[PDB]
Amino acid sequence: KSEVAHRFKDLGEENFKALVLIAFAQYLQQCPFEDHVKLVNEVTEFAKTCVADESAENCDKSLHTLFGDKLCTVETYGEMADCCAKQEPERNECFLQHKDDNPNLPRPEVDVMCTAFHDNEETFLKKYLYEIARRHPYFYAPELLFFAKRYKAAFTECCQDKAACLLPKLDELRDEGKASSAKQRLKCASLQKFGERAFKAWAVARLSQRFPKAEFAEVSKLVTDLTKVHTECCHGDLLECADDRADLAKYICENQDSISSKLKECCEKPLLEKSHCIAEVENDEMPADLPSLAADFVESKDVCKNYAEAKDVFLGMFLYEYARRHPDYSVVLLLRLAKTYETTLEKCCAAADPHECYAKVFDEFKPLVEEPQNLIKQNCELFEQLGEYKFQNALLVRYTKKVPQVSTPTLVEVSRNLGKVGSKCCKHPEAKRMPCAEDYLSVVLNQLCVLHEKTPVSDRVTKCCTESLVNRRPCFSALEVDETYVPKEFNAETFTFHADICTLSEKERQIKKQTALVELVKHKPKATKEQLKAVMDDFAAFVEKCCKADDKETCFAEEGKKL
Numbered sequence: 001k002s003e004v005a006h007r008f009k010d011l012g013e014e015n016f017k018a019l020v021l022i023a024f025a026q027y028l029q030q031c032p033f034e035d036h037v038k039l040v041n042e043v044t045e046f047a048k049t050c051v052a053d054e055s056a057e058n059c060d061k062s063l064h065t066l067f068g069d070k071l072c073t074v075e076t077y078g079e080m081a082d083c084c085a086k087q088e089p090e091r092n093e094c095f096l097q098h099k100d101d102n103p104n105l106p107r108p109e110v111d112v113m114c115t116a117f118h119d120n121e122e123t124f125l126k127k128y129l130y131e132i133a134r135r136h137p138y139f140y141a142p143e144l145l146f147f148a149k150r151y152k153a154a155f156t157e158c159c160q161d162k163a164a165c166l167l168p169k170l171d172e173l174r175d176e177g178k179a180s181s182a183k184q185r186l187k188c189a190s191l192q193k194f195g196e197r198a199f200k201a202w203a204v205a206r207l208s209q210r211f212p213k214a215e216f217a218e219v220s221k222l223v224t225d226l227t228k229v230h231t232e233c234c235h236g237d238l239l240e241c242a243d244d245r246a247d248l249a250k251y252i253c254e255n256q257d258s259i260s261s262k263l264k265e266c267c268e269k270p271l272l273e274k275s276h277c278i279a280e281v282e283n284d285e286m287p288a289d290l291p292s293l294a295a296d297f298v299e300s301k302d303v304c305k306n307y308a309e310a311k312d313v314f315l316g317m318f319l320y321e322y323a324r325r326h327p328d329y330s331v332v333l334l335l336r337l338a339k340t341y342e343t344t345l346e347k348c349c350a351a352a353d354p355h356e357c358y359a360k361v362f363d364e365f366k367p368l369v370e371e372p373q374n375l376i377k378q379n380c381e382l383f384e385q386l387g388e389y390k391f392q393n394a395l396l397v398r399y400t401k402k403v404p405q406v407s408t409p410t411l412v413e414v415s416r417n418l419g420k421v422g423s424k425c426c427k428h429p430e431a432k433r434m435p436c437a438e439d440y441l442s443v444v445l446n447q448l449c450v451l452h453e454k455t456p457v458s459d460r461v462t463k464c465c466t467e468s469l470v471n472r473r474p475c476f477s478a479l480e481v482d483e484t485y486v487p488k489e490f491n492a493e494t495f496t497f498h499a500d501i502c503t504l505s506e507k508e509r510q511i512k513k514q515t516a517l518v519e520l521v522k523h524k525p526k527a528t529k530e531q532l533k534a535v536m537d538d539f540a541a542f543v544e545k546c547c548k549a550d551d552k553e554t555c556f557a558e559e560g561k562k563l
């Protein structure tokens with residue numbers, strides 16, 4: 001009778017409170033912390049009245065109506081959507097469209113924080129959720145609850161040398177948080193830009209690889225439930241998403257003998273740890289003597305009849321059977337082969353002799369398999385030779401010359417993340433490299449697509465990002481150097497002195513040099529590799545000398561006007 005009471009009872013007060021704070025901070029990313037805490041405490045107090053009596057006034061209203069009415073209580077330059085003037089369901093759609101993937105937003109001393117922690121523990125932990133959620137408005141909300149548990153545990157151990165304990169733990173946590181956020185942003189862009197059918201096919205392929213002994217009916221059931229979870233989370237329905245994720249983990253753990261031999265330990269863990277464990281479980285062993293793919297999908301007399309009589313079941317069986325046999329292929333490579341198979345049946349089954357028309361369809365798959373295999377072989381060699389920083393700089397000059405209109409901060413950020421694929425995947429044997437590397441590159445290229453959509457400047461980025469979700473990686477790799485680009489004239493404001501540049505950490509030092517290298521390539525787009533190195537080495541020596549001089553500002557200004 002009351003949906004706010006239903007979710008309060010299922011989730012418990014503590015997780016309900018946290019999920020409503022996450023929801024409000026993802027919808028209004030520029031609103032101060034104290035204003036959101038007010039609204040949350042009021043929603044919670046109301047929810048308790050509906051638990052006491054599901055029939056009290058207002059207790060039958062939808063969650064969208066209740067939350068939106070709260071948000072609407074607290075310079076446009078001529079352009080601003082007015083979400084609070086709308087009725088539901090258009091009002092919720094308006095809030096979703098204001099989410100900002102690159103918001104204009106800004107860690108005290110170790111002893112300071114521990115002082116705040118034992119002072120006001122609850123307030124301390126709510127500030128953590130608020131700052132993550134407002135910077136990452138598509139973070140998977142149930143996973144953010146797991147990060148919060150671990151963030152509390154680090155303080156309730158280390159505050160008891162504190163900086164030698166706490167700071168490495170907090171570093172591993174923002175590292176894994178950044179990678180979690182980018183992985184979920186790909187699921188939401190998949191569902192919203194390319195549709196439910198495209199997300200379902202991605203899930204059929206990934207779960208058939210990971211659960212190869214499961215029957216097709218069992219994989220299809222898991223795919224329907226997983227699709228409902230992510231549709232809710234990406235549409236702002238966070239209390240519903242968390243409750244359905246919990247139910248899916250309970251189903252899997254009661255049905256292990258029909259799904260996978262790898263789930264035992266995952267399924268004995270506490271509640272948030274269990275779902276996190278299942279999502280990252282290793283692939284099960286493939287059954288030994290599976291019948292050939294060619295017999296069911298190429299040689300059978302019934303191919304055209306099965307495609308006409310039950311199109312979605314027949315093509316979903318093709319994808320399940322191919323994926324469970326090929327854990328060594330990326331997901332995007334399997335989705336490419338299924339699209340090629342369907343296109344070939346549409347043409348052949350409408351003509352005279354189909355059996356001979358599609359008899360060689362597996363020959364068309366070989367160029368598609370070989371192109372990614374060769375790419376990853378070569379970058380792992382280059383990585384082994386150069387190391388991560390110089391591998392990054394190689395990828396940065398390459399991508400700047402493909403799309404030089406893109407902004408310098410976006411080129412540095414994407415290029416640094418493309419180069420992390422070396423440390424992440426090149427240690428695996430040949431066979432495990434392709435899923436690791438090509439599915440990671442899909443996540444990083446989606447980052448480039450959504451950071452560029454806000455302010456489009458490169459027609460070639462817009463085309464590669466809109467044409468085909470599965471073909472994005474081969475589309476970017478195929479771009480040649482841009483010959484139409486006009487060299488950027490020299491500015492100088494990039495290089496104004498700031499005191500921090502003489503006391504940089506190693507990571508900060510690399511980011512500055514990679515920024516200078518992108519600007520140099522934009523200014524001199526046809527200088528050679530050796531010419532770029534000589535200029536870069538000379539400017540870095542200039543910074544070195546002026547950071548030692550008796551008057552730093554004067555040296556930078558005096559020697560800078562000479563350069």
Ligand SMILES: N[C@@H](Cc1cc(I)c(Oc2cc(I)c(O)c(I)c2)c(I)c1)C(=O)O
Binds near residue numbers: 375376382398477
């Ligand atoms: N000296 C090498 C040439 C080479 C340079 C780069 I830089 C590279 O790295 C990438 C990564 C991605 I992702 C791409 O889309 C592209 I195009 C190149 C690779 I692999 C090879 C050789 O001859 O083998």
Ligand SMILES: N[C@@H](Cc1cc(I)c(Oc2cc(I)c(O)c(I)c2)c(I)c1)C(=O)O
Binds near residue numbers: 496498504515539
């Ligand atoms: N204007 C910025 C500070 C800033 C100064 C310089 I001078 C600079 O250029 C280099 C070039 C090389 I090559 C280096 O190794 C280094 I370290 C800095 C850059 I990028 C940034 C601010 O106000 O924050």
Ligand SMILES: N[C@@H](Cc1cc(I)c(Oc2cc(I)c(O)c(I)c2)c(I)c1)C(=O)O
Binds near residue numbers: 490520536539563
């Ligand atoms: N003297 C020229 C202007 C000019 C100034 C600099 I200082 C320079 O050197 C760099 C080094 C890096 I590293 C960059 O990212 C960039 I942009 C320019 C170059 I080549 C040209 C004129 O009067 O027209």
